[PDB]
Amino acid sequence: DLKKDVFVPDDKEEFVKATILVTAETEHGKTVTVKEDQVLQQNPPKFDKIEDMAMLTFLHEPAVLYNLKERYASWMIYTYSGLFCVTINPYKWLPVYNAEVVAAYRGKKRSEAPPHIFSISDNAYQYMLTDRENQSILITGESGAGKTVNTKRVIQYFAVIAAIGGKGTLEDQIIQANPALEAFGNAKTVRNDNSSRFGKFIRIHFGATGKLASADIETYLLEKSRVIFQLKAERDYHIFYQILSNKKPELLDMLLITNNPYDYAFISQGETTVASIDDAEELMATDNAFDVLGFTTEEKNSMYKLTGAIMHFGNMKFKLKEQAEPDGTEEADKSAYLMGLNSADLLKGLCHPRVKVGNEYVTKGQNVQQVVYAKGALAKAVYERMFNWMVTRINATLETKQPRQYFIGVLDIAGFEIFDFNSFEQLCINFTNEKLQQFFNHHMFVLEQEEYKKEGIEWEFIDFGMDLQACIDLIEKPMGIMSILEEECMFPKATDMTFKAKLFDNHLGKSSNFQKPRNIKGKPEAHFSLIHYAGTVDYNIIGWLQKNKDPLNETVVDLYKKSSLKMLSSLFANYAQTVSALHRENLNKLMTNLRSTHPHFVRCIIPNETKSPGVIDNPLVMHQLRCNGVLEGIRICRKGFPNRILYGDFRQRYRILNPAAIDSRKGAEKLLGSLDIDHNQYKFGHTKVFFKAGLLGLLEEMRDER
Numbered sequence: 001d002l003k004k005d006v007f008v009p010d011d012k013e014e015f016v017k018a019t020i021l022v023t024a025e026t027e028h029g030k031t032v033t034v035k036e037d038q039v040l041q042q043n044p045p046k047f048d049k050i051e052d053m054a055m056l057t058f059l060h061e062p063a064v065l066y067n068l069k070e071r072y073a074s075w076m077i078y079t080y081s082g083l084f085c086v087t088i089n090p091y092k093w094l095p096v097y098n099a100e101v102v103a104a105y106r107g108k109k110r111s112e113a114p115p116h117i118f119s120i121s122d123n124a125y126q127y128m129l130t131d132r133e134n135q136s137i138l139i140t141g142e143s144g145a146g147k148t149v150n151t152k153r154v155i156q157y158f159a160v161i162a163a164i165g166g167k168g169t170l171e172d173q174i175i176q177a178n179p180a181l182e183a184f185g186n187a188k189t190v191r192n193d194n195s196s197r198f199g200k201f202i203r204i205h206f207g208a209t210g211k212l213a214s215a216d217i218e219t220y221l222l223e224k225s226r227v228i229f230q231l232k233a234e235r236d237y238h239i240f241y242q243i244l245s246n247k248k249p250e251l252l253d254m255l256l257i258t259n260n261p262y263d264y265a266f267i268s269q270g271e272t273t274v275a276s277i278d279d280a281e282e283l284m285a286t287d288n289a290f291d292v293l294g295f296t297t298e299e300k301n302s303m304y305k306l307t308g309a310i311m312h313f314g315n316m317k318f319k320l321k322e323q324a325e326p327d328g329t330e331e332a333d334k335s336a337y338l339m340g341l342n343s344a345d346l347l348k349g350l351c352h353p354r355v356k357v358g359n360e361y362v363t364k365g366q367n368v369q370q371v372v373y374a375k376g377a378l379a380k381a382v383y384e385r386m387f388n389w390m391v392t393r394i395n396a397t398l399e400t401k402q403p404r405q406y407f408i409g410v411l412d413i414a415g416f417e418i419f420d421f422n423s424f425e426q427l428c429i430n431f432t433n434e435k436l437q438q439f440f441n442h443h444m445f446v447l448e449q450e451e452y453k454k455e456g457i458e459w460e461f462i463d464f465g466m467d468l469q470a471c472i473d474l475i476e477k478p479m480g481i482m483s484i485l486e487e488e489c490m491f492p493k494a495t496d497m498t499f500k501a502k503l504f505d506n507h508l509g510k511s512s513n514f515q516k517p518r519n520i521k522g523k524p525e526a527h528f529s530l531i532h533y534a535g536t537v538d539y540n541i542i543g544w545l546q547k548n549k550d551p552l553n554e555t556v557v558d559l560y561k562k563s564s565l566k567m568l569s570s571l572f573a574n575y576a577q578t579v580s581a582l583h584r585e586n587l588n589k590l591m592t593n594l595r596s597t598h599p600h601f602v603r604c605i606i607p608n609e610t611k612s613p614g615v616i617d618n619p620l621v622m623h624q625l626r627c628n629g630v631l632e633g634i635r636i637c638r639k640g641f642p643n644r645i646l647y648g649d650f651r652q653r654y655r656i657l658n659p660a661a662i663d664s665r666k667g668a669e670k671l672l673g674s675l676d677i678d679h680n681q682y683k684f685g686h687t688k689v690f691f692k693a694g695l696l697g698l699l700e701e702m703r704d705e706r
């Protein structure tokens, strides 16, 4: 029936379906009666599994939710929601990404094909060529939402398309770039078995005529901590376990290592084996990528060797001679050999680092705690610089002579996360997520409406309540969290509790997003809460000062410069601005570069905590849609004018409909006036015609009929 089919709220599944008898029979048999305002209307059965939710008769939270659920139940993981797309992780291989599908998607306008990541990529390609404007596919979502998978699919689309008309070709190299970086930059966290522990902006360059000419990858802050430290239910980087699988046994001999991960302390404090990952086939995938990318055998063995030496570096034991002196050089020797260093000099550098007395030097003393930190810090430093060397190396092969004119950047940041223990690297991760959401908010809600004003369109502003400046300002602005941290790791007599005290003194009761920690019994200790867009996060400030300073035993880095392993020497070649400072510098650099592109938002949704295919946790999925502003992003499309054409281009294409109607603007007034259309569905701007949602479809349908 018309009014019988309704949605009623539900304390366990957010909302549930109902049949009116206000008293109504629930989808699950519960005879429940509720308040008339709490009842939302179901959409007609013609809109079941709708490809675009802006086309629904009833727009509300359960109408969107149940449509997404319905599509997901038929394994339809892509859905349009106004000018952007939403995708729910299937946690399962679907046959929607083959070459035959890629080929079919080529050139098809959004409406001419089912919703898909291929359609986003293709239409970004058409906009780039048509408007002569750089494009950017911006993929959002928490840890394990599916950003990396969708990112790899955009590359796949472009690479397959460019092939239809180092060792490999530009297209294969662009594809293989991801398995090479994932090996060293991805790791199993609680939420994701292949969690991206770093952000990346991949630009795909095209010539004036659309030919794929080049590519570049820029990465953002890697989780160095992971190299030498793990939480209970997480692993170190993929590579360590892949190398230990022994699929390449020469590697173990070269790296002087056992096959047991539990032998190496740096890499075995959490988990070692992951059901989802076959570390052995993965090592082959890792190695193969390096070959296709043009990495020499010395280049490869140098990366392997440096990883190996890092493992031994962890097992370097130290004792009291307060002054530390070594406690067995066995592992210290294995590391120095692999690193092209003198083992005695490495240990003298560690236990007694120099202090320059003009042109002479005097050593300083170090205790076992000081040496153990120094040792850990140098391994993280190496790994970070090795990942950086590897990215520049990939770029060097991807950088072709070929002429470029445009680009399509694809942003794959590390997703929003909440662990049992959240520290500095969680803050940097969630900060980016907050920033990108605000980028969506500003583009979708602010710039959009300011275009209607610019064009002299009759429009009365809408406040969608989509603004995160308060929380962004708290983290980045002066006297914010990072500003306080930056100043504190400058005063040498500062402590974790002086930074914690300064944090509280400036924001407790002053900043609304800065709150006391909501510490629950058993869980690790936290110092403050941060009301982020996707949740409140309890951060622990222990060690943040040293994380931001990131000092190294300079005496050991000098031996690294002097190393007889070309790679290790060049990693520290220029060695001599805090972590958070460069993080904000890079983030602001990125947000402004994305301002100069036409953006394409792909919103990934994690369906459940248990990595369960087809299974949707209504509360969790709704929370995502809510903190993403999906319902707001659809409303601005329905309530506004999402489509607009210049008077010239409207004449050049649609004059055919009624050639009797032909000035460029006056002609469009006659053409639209003469056609049988709702004369409220279009408004005249200074230089453009503003179409209400759907009308442009009718006009392109009427153009095809002759």
Ligand SMILES: Nc1ncnc2c1ncn2[C@@H]1O[C@H](COP(=O)(O)OP(=O)(O)O)[C@@H](O)[C@H]1O
Binding pocket: 077, 089, 090, 091, 092, 093, 094, 141, 142, 143, 144, 145, 146, 147, 148, 149, 150, 192, 194, 195, 196, 415, 604
């Ligand atoms: N479209 C998809 N098809 C199949 N599996 C997917 C898809 N998207 C995500 N997944 C699954 O989710 C996991 C995590 O996805 P991923 O993109 O790596 O997460 P994140 O948002 O952290 O980058 C993948 O390893 C895979 O199992």
Ligand code: VO4
Binding pocket: 141, 142, 143, 144, 145, 147, 148, 191, 192, 194, 195, 196, 197, 413, 414, 415, 416
């Ligand atoms: O798990 V993530 O790839 O979103 O960091």
Ligand SMILES: [Mg+2]
Binding pocket: 147, 148, 194, 195, 196, 197, 413, 414, 415
């Ligand atoms: Mg990722």
